[PDB]
């Protein structure tokens, strides 16, 4: 099983490589995660200067298989059965009134560290809109994720909106479509529909000069 790769502390990595409007960037993130409580903790940068993005509108993109699975639903855990071979990420997330991020990754074991390795490509933004004009607060408003099996690809799905908040007023919409699959050609768990709760809170580190994102997540699944 590749819930049993979950039972302790699990280092996480995360490798994004990003092109908006042709504004290219890479991001990378270490941490771990402890799915027994379903925490995560990461430390992100931007390693190629300053992001052109708010990092608010990258924290989707930048591991599901950490929430925690209460075990009357050990069952119904997609993301940890998957493991080690893993699964791939798939999303598109629709800015209202800009432009749209498209998201591949694959999520799985390189030695004992979770890895999620993205690709992102971003069209059609305004250069001087909510995102490539910098004017999103640096906070979170987290949202469900009903995910839902799909048995015609072996994997899930799940469809939500995220709410960013402006600056200068009112809020900029984040329509996000996801689609996973898994990497492996041995069985995987078709989940009954359930819901992922997730709470996160984004900080600086105040001895760090780059553009960077602390973030610390706690995330469960509930059935009904």
């Not at 629709?94 to 498209?102: A, C, L, P, Q, W």
């Amino acid at each position: 099983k590749g819930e049993e790769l979950f039972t302790g502390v699990v280092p996480i990595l995360v490798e994004l490589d990003g092109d908006v409007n042709g504004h290219k960037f890479s991001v990378s993130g270490e941490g771990e995660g402890d799915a027994t409580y379903g925490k995560l903790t990461l430390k992100f940068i931007c390693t190629t200067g300053k992001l052109p993005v708010p990092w608010p509108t990258l924290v989707t993109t930048l591991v599901q298989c950490f929430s925690r699975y209460p075990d009357h639903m050990k069952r119904h855990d997609f993301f940890k059965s998957a493991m080690p071979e893993g699964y791939v990420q798939e999303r598109t997330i629709f800015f209202k009134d800009d432009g749209n991020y498209k998201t591949r990754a694959e999520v799985k074991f390189e030695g004992d560290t979770l890895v999620n390795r993205i690709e992102l490509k971003g069209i059609d933004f305004k250069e001087d809109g909510n995102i490539l004009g910098h004017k999103l607060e640096y906070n979170y408003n987290d949202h469900q994720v009903y995910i839902m099996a799909d048995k015609q690809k072996n994997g899930i799905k799940a469809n939500f909106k995220i709410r960013h908040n402006i600056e200068d007023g009112g809020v900029q919409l984040a329509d996000h479509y996801q689609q996973n699959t898994p990497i492996g050609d041995g069985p995987v768990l078709l989940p009954d529909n359930h819901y992922l709760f997730t709470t996160s809170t984004l900080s600086k580190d105040p001895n760090e000069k780059r553009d960077h994102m602390v973030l610390l997540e706690f995330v469960t699944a509930a059935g009904i």
